[PDB]
């Protein structure tokens, strides 16, 4: 197998990988990108005169990393635990009729729920945060201005 | 000729809500 036969295989592999890439069939496109790069790697070992070969190897392997697709979920798990904690504390002051602290704690929960919902695109998370903020604001206002 | 790549690339609110529900009473 010489460079000329390896370069031609590399062209048929990449042509098939890009059309599967186009079709969103990303998992078989990884396979043919990996076959393409490997054909080129052997081709450079065989003395390939192709002038952009190293670039094209690197192109295809990067496309495999791009298609392969965290610490933000960690942050949001803790933010929710805090909102839950704040509301729980407020629940404590609420039942003990420590009205002023209950109001402060309910409204700090509000700020945390609205602020966290600007840090996400998950609309289901956004609404759950806004429903807890709405509920806590309602109760704070109930403690603050009894009708 | 070698083609190029495409341009193309919790807690439980419910127990809170339940407790809020009882508080409106």
Numbering used by the authors:
A (entry chain C): 1 to 69, 77 to 154
B (entry chain G): 324 to 332, 349 to 364
From the paper:
CAPN7 contains tandem MIT domains that can bind specifically to the ESCRT-III subunit IST1. Many of these cofactors contain microtubule-interacting and trafficking (MIT) domains, which bind differentially to MIT-interacting motifs (MIMs) located near the C termini of the different human ESCRT-III proteins. Hence, IST1 recruits CAPN7 to midbodies, where its proteolytic activity is required to regulate and complete abscission.
We determined the crystal structure of the CAPN7(MIT)2–IST1322-366 complex to define the interaction in molecular detail and distinguish between the four possible binding modes in which individual CAPN7 MIT domains either bound simultaneously to both IST1 MIMs, as reported in other MIT:MIM interactions, or each CAPN7 MIT domain bound a different IST1 MIM element in one of two possible pairwise interactions. The structure revealed that each MIT domain binds a different MIM element, which is a configuration that has not been documented previously. The asymmetric unit contains two copies of the CAPN7(MIT)2 –IST1322-366 complex, and the flexible linkers between the different MIT and MIM elements could, in principle, connect the linked IST1 MIM-CAPN7 complexes in two different ways. The N-terminal IST1 MIM element binds in an extended conformation in the helix 1/3 groove of the N-terminal CAPN7 MIT domain, making a canonical ‘type 2’ (MIM2) interaction. The binding interface spans IST1 residues 324–332 (324VLPELPSVP332), which resembles the previously defined MIM2 consensus sequence (ΦPXΦPXXPΦP, where Φ represents a hydrophobic residue and X a variable (often polar) residue; Kojima et al., 2016). The C-terminal IST1 MIM element (349DIDFDDLSRRFEELKK364) forms an amphipathic helix that packs between helices 1 and 3 of the C-terminal CAPN7 MIT domain, making a canonical ‘type 3’ (MIM3) interaction. Core residues from the hydrophobic face of the IST1 helix are buried in the CAPN7 MIT helix 1/3 groove, and the interface hydrophobic contacts, hydrogen bonds, and salt bridges are nearly identical to those seen when this same IST1 motif makes a type 3 interaction with the MIT domain of SPARTIN.
